[model samples]
Target chain A: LSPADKTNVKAAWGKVGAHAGEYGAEALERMFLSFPTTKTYFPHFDLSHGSAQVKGHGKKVADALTNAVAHVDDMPNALSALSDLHAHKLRVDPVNFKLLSHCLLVTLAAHLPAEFTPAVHASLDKFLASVSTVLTSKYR
Target chain B: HLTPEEKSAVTALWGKVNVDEVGGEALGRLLVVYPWTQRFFESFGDLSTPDAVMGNPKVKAHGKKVLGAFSDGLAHLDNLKGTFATLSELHCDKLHVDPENFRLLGNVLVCVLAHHFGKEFTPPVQAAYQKVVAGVANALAHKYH
Candidate 1:
């Protein structure tokens, strides 16, 4: 990413602050609602809105995204183990990541309208795509 | 939906390079930089490494096909959605690619253009190309909803 993009990313992520999980949950909620096929990945979890399982998993998702921001320079190493689990064990379809990403963008735009300018949206999209790429890299 | 000046910027820049070569490099970079995207091309073979994917003949051929679609889009700028309607169905129903990947590929193509054209791919030119690719992506992904 360009230097400007990195700046926008850091600023936007910081602005999201402690409520990252809430934002994450909203994104997942939208994902489940808009793309029912994505729910196949979480067969064991309750997908109902505001479910305890979803709220907890959303925090995990938020943590992973935070990790991505921290390791923006060397994501392959930082996310190596997570990638193996997703690719080899979970066997999640790579396409689902993109679907979820779209949901995340929509969620962020809805809640963080002032911060999610076109430039920030573009950077966040790139950042999510990078994370998804790493998570799906271990697939053979 | 390019403005008159934006359309001129796109045309002038595109006239300077070979779409196939740029497209091949763009696709190769996409596969290497975003390996998950390679899932759709399992039949292409030997994508185990970035070098192998870059040098593969099948990749180059497929690159031409991908580039051909964008070329078609550029030619029909006035009616991109109409032009890509059937191709959108094919990708959505048969190819099974995520629509977001269209934006990814478009950004990769932009990077490739920047690498090749350097100064010629000025801010205004890049902005114009972004609109072009954005239109193409929206047109191709329109079948999803």
Candidate 2:
């Protein structure tokens, strides 16, 4: 990537990393509340519990993704790993990823009202598109 | 990614660096540098004092390697941090992993460290590691979500 691209990417990433817990919690709570059946598998998780638990789970997923991104420079491998985990281990319906994405957007809109500019939204959208392309490529 | 106040605090701590410096480019470099430096901090878990850790020949060699790697990585900051930022956006806002998982990850890291270091680590070292991990997780969560 060009230097300018790098700067924008970092700034964007910093913003996402900085607010991940807030938005992540919002998204998770919405998902779990909306789909009570999914809640059974994640009994330990409850939005009513408090911010501590919410931030804690957000950190794990964030770190895992960080570790994955740091190690796997190859997009194909990274994408494959994600696809495998969801498809096999988690056994989540592939379509649910999109639903999850919607939840994320909603959460972002709610949590980052000030920073959620059109440009910021566009950046996030592009990032998700790349993620989805990698995730769904195998099924197609 | 930090709030204006948090940014100010970080700047005061570091001192003299260009505060405006940001983006995936810088962050991508940070990610690449982490693997090498991660072990140096790991060594601190084993040794009692920083001086003791630094004095050991083996540890000294490791430290040198880490420092060298760190400098090289910093030179490429624009790339590393940016990649990290991109990845953060992809996972945090895209996959929508819950905030709770970040705390879980910190707990898991503690377990992993204890498993590796056994009794060599002091309580403070363990606590510090967990704190830093949790802080990073929190930062990422807030930045993205």
For lDDT, the strongest prediction is 1
A57-106: candidate 1 lDDT, tens digit per residue: 88888888888888888889998989998876665678898888899889
Candidate 2's interface RMSD, please? 17.3
- What is the C-alpha lDDT profile of model 2 across B1-145, one tens digit per residue? 2334433433232242222221121221222222232232443343343234334454444434433432332333334344245445654877565555545344333333333333333233343343344454554466455
The pairs that clash in candidate 1 are none
Q: DockQ for each of the predicted structures, in order? A: 0.12, 0.02
lDDT, candidate 1, B84-134, per-residue tens: 999998877677677888899999999999999999889988889999889
Query: Which one wins on TM-score?
Result: 1
Each model's TM-score, in the order given? Answer: 0.60, 0.38
Candidate 2 per-residue C-alpha lDDT over A44-136 given as tens digits, one digit per residue, 9 for 90 to 100? 755564457766876655554444334333555765776766555666654555445544544554444454433344444344445555666
| Candidate 2 displacement at residue B105 in angstroms | 35
CAPRI accuracy category, model 1: incorrect
CAPRI tier for the interface of model 2: incorrect
